[PDB]
Amino acid sequence: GWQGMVDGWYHHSYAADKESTQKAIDGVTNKVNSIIDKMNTQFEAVGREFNNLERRIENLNKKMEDGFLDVWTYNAELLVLMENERTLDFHDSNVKNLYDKVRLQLRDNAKENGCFEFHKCDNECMESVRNGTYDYPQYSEE
Amino acid sequence: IEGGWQGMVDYHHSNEQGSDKESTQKAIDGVTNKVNSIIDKMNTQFEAVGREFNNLERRIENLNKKMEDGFLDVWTYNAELLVLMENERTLDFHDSNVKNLYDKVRLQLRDNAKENGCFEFYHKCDNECMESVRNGTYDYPQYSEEARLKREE
Amino acid sequence: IEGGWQGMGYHHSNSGYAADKESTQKAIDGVTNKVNSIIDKMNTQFEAVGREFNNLERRIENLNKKMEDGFLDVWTYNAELLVLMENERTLDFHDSNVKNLYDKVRLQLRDNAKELGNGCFEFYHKCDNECMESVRNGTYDYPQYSEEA
Amino acid sequence: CIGYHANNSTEQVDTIMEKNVTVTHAQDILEKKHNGKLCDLDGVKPLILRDCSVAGWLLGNPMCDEVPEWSYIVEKANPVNDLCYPGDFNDYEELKHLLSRINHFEKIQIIPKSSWSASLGVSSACPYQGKSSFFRNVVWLIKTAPTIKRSYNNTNQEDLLVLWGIHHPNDAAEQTKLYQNPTTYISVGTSTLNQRLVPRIATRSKVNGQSGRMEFFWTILKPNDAINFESNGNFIAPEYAYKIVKKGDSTIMKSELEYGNCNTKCQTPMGAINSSMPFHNIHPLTIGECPKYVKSNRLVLATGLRNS
Amino acid sequence: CIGYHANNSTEQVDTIMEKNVTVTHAQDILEKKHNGKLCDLDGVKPLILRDCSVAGWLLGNPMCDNVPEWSYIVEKANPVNDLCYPGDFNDYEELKHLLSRINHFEKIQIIPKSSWSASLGVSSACPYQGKSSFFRNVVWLIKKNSTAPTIKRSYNNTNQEDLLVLWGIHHPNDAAEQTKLYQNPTTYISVGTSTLNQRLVPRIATRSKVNGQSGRMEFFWTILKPNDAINFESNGNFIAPEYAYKIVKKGDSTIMKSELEYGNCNTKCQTPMGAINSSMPFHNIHPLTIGECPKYVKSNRLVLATGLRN
Amino acid sequence: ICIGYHANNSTEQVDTIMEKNVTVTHAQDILEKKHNGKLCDLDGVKPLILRDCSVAGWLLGNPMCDNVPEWSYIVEKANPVNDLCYPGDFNDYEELKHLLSRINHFEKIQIIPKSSWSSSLGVSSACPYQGKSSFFRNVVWLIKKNSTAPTIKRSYNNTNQEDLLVLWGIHHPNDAAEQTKLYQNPTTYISVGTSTLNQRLVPRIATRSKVNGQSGRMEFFWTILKPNDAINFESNGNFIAPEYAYKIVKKGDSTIMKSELEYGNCNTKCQTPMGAINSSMPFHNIHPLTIGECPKYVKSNRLVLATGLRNS
Ligand SMILES: *[C@@H]1O[C@H](CO)[C@@H](O[C@@H]2O[C@H](CO)[C@@H](O[C@@H]3O[C@H](CO)[C@@H](O)[C@H](O)[C@@H]3O)[C@H](O)[C@H]2NC(C)=O)[C@H](O)[C@H]1NC(C)=O
Ligand SMILES: O=C(CO)N[C@H]1[C@H]([C@H](O)[C@H](O)CO)O[C@@](O[C@@H]2[C@@H](O)[C@H](O)O[C@H](CO)[C@@H]2O)(C(=O)O)C[C@@H]1O
Ligand SMILES: *[C@@H]1O[C@H](CO)[C@@H](O[C@@H]2O[C@H](CO)[C@@H](O)[C@H](O)[C@H]2NC(C)=O)[C@H](O)[C@H]1NC(C)=O
């Protein structure tokens, strides 16, 4: 993809799509927000308060301390790995969804690299492509 | 296809004469399977109790507290996430099947119509011609010439 | 694609089957890292489970029951649904891989063939066996057979 | 034209990337409702103590009322009738957890008041009908104080729970007053049990108008074992015992509610739960098969599509 | 054309089907940082004992040094000043757990040292100012002159809070040595309460010298309700209480083991390696935490992909 | 030219969060269900197994019970028939077993011989060695000598390099009349002292039912003698004195296992009373009472993932 595009996350024959970038930045921010905020934190005290003649209960506390570490680590690791592809495949869709958004917009006014060669088309003609307000019958016969 | 149509309670046909359970039943059995599995795959449940420790056993009382609070933190966090995960994975399945069905008509009729998720034919298509669009048995070579001549106008 | 290729990729009528090595080994390397990461990310740290409480220690014995049964429910439920959640991710990834290889061929030959409906293209020109490497390799030349279409 | 459904729905779900998605149809899996009364647990009535503790009910507390099978026990948060004569109960929390779920329970006279003939004793801390009484199920022995030797063999088919006690007077005078020997012992013998109780005289504060104490003990007499007693004088001897069949475990439930003729799978001190749902948020102190307790209010799945 | 973003990104993420995929922007949800010093807990400073144990600080050990409130207790791994005179403590771990979090704590003299003139004692194992002494907060009752009379003393609680009483018994070395200290060979201690009823008898046994001491001393405790009275009675071998402790109990905590020392700060999660100031959901700092803390996880990197692949 | 997916002769089926009984090209299960049905070593450390004896009966010298210097866990069968040949109790018996669950060095030591205690010795018919009655081999029962039993004062000082476990006991006679027959003094004590321990035992006379033909009981106690501390015994007459002790080395903990199988020459990282487990899988459904680095116990029969594409 393009490296010089800092406007956001089109190219003219750059200006990033302000709509899909706003829908993406707001959405992925909400996913990290829900991952952190859904956690429930309560006051707990850990201190190993059993003497050497209470070692059986000391082992019972171990089995639950060690048991919870096994559960959280497996969930946290797999949640990271599962949501990362769902994020990296979420970006595989936005390109083709923005491609078809413009492809189905101008139907026969150009020829299909994710690029289109158009009738010649100016700045006001391509800023209308980004807006979603592209007038097809204005350049239909050409 | 913005907003979706409201009048569909059972496609919408554009025709001079008048104004889909194949993919719906597949989605009805598919999403209901997800809700049933969320309830039924955790069907394993045993007995539970309360609290039975006196004033000189408050260390063990804090041990039972640590695991109860530790379990509530687990079940709450996973269930809240499972809702959020399976709610979007449900909604994404709707937008997924739409293009699968939108392309189905686009694949079926090609040059006999022009591409909002709507189509209007180059030829005339009556109330019985739209049988073949719903059934999947559309005769493309039949309306070939009728689309060719009315295309060069 | 109603019928699967029972006899096998690509299939041509010129006629034989030839699987795509670039797309298959990429997907095999991806799923192998999935099953591995499911098994490898599990942490085990040597716990010894046994009933060691006497008759007058049933309450502490009952407390161990709640945590033994409690962890059983977390692991049983999460394992059953992780299978269900990751099985769907795979079968949708296979439907995702059919289209991603289909669009690579469809965007390769633009106006030089015709989409039938079975996932096949009938060329507007004649394409021989050395011509169909261009479609498979990714080295397909559009302007050569352009006017023939 | 192709499109998706939409109706006049107000149901909302939450997407992991979107908050407040208006949805066609939604289903909730978080149980939030209860019927608000104690019920049976898998078709078995609970043992509900009105104003009595497990001690005052097991013993013969005169202020306590006199069911052979129960799934769990319910006692008020602070029962009023514990021990009319103040004292302790050895391994009381283990005795309660043992009786929490019982398959068979039967009160049996093993050695009656007539076989205790030393005299019987009463104090005013246990009022029954305007006249000072004592525990129904045990007997207070008072003197010349002689040595008492009597054993009971378990001839029944089931396990037997025997209860006995010892009196700890206030001063050395209250002992000689009632128990002639200044030095006293109580020896209980079983194939398992081997103990010997000596009274502990100490100046204590008044509880229910009594400075003395009474400490109770118990074992499970195996169905063909014999229990043997030998005491010098400070003996609170058993008159009744309880046969027990133990098939499962439960807990003692704390709630101020009363019984209703209902049945449920999950019990809660705020009301029973009839739910196949996987989660609930009612109360943590649950008994029986229950959904997982959760600190949340909304667990709504999206069964339909997004609306305009 | 239609394209996507790219920048000068070096951070890598892992995903379920690919390993090490360079990504535009990334964020870690695993907290690995700690300030390395002890702080308060939700606004309350903790009770720190540098070289003294909870038993050595509760009793009047001369090797030890009055804060009325604390969120949790910190004592080093093995404080150097436990019981200067060797012995044990009854329900010591539950008493430590009871005092782990106290809302109000105040030492109170209940029966003065003068009110037991039986005589007093002083062992060389508990040095005060070079000249040996005993515990400050409790009094060792010995016999006096020719005979060992019986002691009957009873303290009634008149405060509005629960108060903690501490007393003990001395276990002599030999039977002939007890006759020296306490004229009667048969001895007892009777502690009476509406709740408590105990009677202690000394166990004469040959033991190894700890701090130059073959004899031991065993301590006990209860909590006296605001309008209840505790009553002692002894024939000797009695370690009597001089001070008490009014207690206001509002919550629970635990005893943290850390050699670190205090810093004037505040935190929500405490760790023997230093407090934590994190809003993250996971951490890999230490298993023994106090306060509302994230979940402990055995991993080094839990990085999500916030941007697209570069 | 066409584009499509694979299909072969396979009936392996998996389930999906939206579909069920899907016919798949290839499948793989991640739930461990197989066990070799025999006890093995843990990370290369043999287990301590008792055929018909208990830990108490083996620790003491029960004549029916039979040496190993290192083990990972302890196996005693459901109900051992050779417990306490002379009936009684064991103080902190549950805590003591958890200590001996994993021992890196175990070496029996005679600290105070049988002859030294004589100055005689007691035998019961409840502990028959070979028809002719004997007693525990590791602890000695003391009876009056020359019709008058005086105070016995014998102390042992640990001079070894490791902690060592001392065992002693007290006899509770049936009636007070039998005591005078065995021990001249009617009132009796047993004082045991270390820098750690302080206790004084008193006989507890009570009429009891016969167990193994004996109604008198014998209660046992134990401590761990630190390397340079000494233990001092002083008893009036009811003494069951220590003759043998055990040096111990503690570098890890385990649990006591209940199984009827006995040793097979195998190795494992995870053990089960039904047989060990060889597993890279993170889950299993064998047994809950596991020992070792084990997969997580799960209630399921099939946890099969999909390794191939869906087949028609
Ligand atoms: C511990 O000390 C407290 C403080 O004196 C003692 O409490 C008091 O006991 C006396 C007599 O038992 C109570 O006397 C009365 O007041 C009521 C009206 O409330 C009146 O009807 C009576 O005639 C009498 O004057 C006093 O109220 C009570 N104080 C409190 C705060 O309860 C207590 O008895 C001492 N504990 C022991 C066991 O020594
Ligand atoms: O008399 C008092 C009152 O403070 N203390 C003496 C104590 C006390 O008698 C014992 O602890 C009772 O068991 O004993 C001291 O005695 C030891 C002595 O036993 C030993 O054999 O030698 C030591 C020095 O080597 C001490 O003297 C003690 O300091 O604890 C002396 C006290 O005066
Ligand atoms: C308790 O009652 C049982 C029932 O009679 C007694 O058990 C019997 O003991 C005799 C002799 O030991 C045997 O011959 C019988 O077969 C036993 N009966 C049963 C049902 O086992 C037992 O002896 C009594 N206990 C005591 C000590 O009196």
Ligand SMILES: *[C@@H]1O[C@H](CO)[C@@H](O[C@@H]2O[C@H](CO)[C@@H](O)[C@H](O)[C@H]2NC(C)=O)[C@H](O)[C@H]1NC(C)=O
């Ligand atoms: C137990 O035996 C050891 C070895 O003799 C004793 O330890 C020694 O004590 C003497 C005199 O107190 C010292 O000279 C040695 O240096 C000590 N050795 C060590 C390694 O410290 C010990 O005192 C005896 N224990 C008891 C309780 O008597």
Ligand SMILES: *[C@@H]1O[C@H](CO)[C@@H](O)[C@H](O)[C@H]1NC(C)=O
């Ligand atoms: C969504 O709506 C609910 C109630 O309508 C409200 O609690 C919440 O704050 C809303 N979210 C946003 C982001 O507005």
Ligand SMILES: *[C@@H]1O[C@H](CO)[C@@H](O)[C@H](O)[C@H]1NC(C)=O
């Ligand atoms: C799936 O197949 C298995 C055996 O083939 C059978 O037990 C089960 O009932 C089947 N499920 C359905 C829904 O047919």
